[PDB]
Design a protein around this motif. Structure first.
Motif: not given
Length: 90
Positions: A68-85
């Motif tokens: 209504d008078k602002g924004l919620e902003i999320i920020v994320t990073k690739a390290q969340l899935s550094k383990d994947l392979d």
């Protein structure tokens, strides 16, 4: 402004229009420029930087919603899935 620590990789914050005005940005100008958006994200990485120094090894990622008078902003990073392979469909 208002900050949250979801986990080590996702953070979010809430930014009232007046927090943007204070910094001399505009709620619209944040989205309608591109380089001047980045400054918002630097301002919140800054709020974490004594721990971001352990994890500054990949890009930033951003998502937002407006309220209504602002924004919620999320920020994320690739390290969340550094383990994947190691995962396989078996």
């Amino acid at each position: 402004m208002e900050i949250e620590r979801i986990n080590e990789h996702t953070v979010k914050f809430y930014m009232s229009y007046g927090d943007i005005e204070d910094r001399g940005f505009d709620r619209e100008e944040i989205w309608y420029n591109r380089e001047r958006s980045e400054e918002l994200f630097w301002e919140v990485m800054d709020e974490v930087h004594e721990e971001e120094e352990f994890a500054v090894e990949g890009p930033l990622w951003i998502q937002v919603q407006a309220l209504d008078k602002g924004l919620e902003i999320i920020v994320t990073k690739a390290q969340l899935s550094k383990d994947l392979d190691k995962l396989v469909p078996r």
